[PDB]
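Schema walkthrough. Field components (list of strings):
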Amino acid sequence: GELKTILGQAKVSKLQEKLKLDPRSKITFNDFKGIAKEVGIEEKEINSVSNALAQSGSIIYLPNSLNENLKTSVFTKPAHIYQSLEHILDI
Amino acid sequence: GELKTILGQAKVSKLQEKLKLDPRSKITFNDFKGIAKEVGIEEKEINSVSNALAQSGSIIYLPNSLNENLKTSVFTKPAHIYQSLEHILDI
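Field assembly_structure (string):
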């Protein structure tokens, strides 16, 4: 199923590109779902895609957080957050 | 916790930026593992990180492919592959 795998991945790549163009750096998870649907990602796959993007460091999305804000927020440009955190904690 | 999750993700973000700057567009999984180790990702974590990067569309990695070339190859700049494939097949 190499062809099917690649073509589905291509949609998430488009999602990554669109989050890059978007000037927002923090959006709601509902906002994120809408952008994912714009590039053709099916509803039943959005949760899985959000998890893959978080584990790959492409977004920060912390649905298990008890902080009400982080729980429903998607950070779409997390490189700045990673770099800032390692700077201020000197690690 | 949120902080450990973010700092773990930061390593995979660093891996993505190393792969972007590497002149090669196709590397062995062995070489991929080595670059990941350079940024602190252990061999114990590599399979999960590669799954997340593949599902995110950040790499193409088809280890179960029967084509002997693809099964050990990591495509580190797949954006051009996605574009070409959708173009030549007209969706």
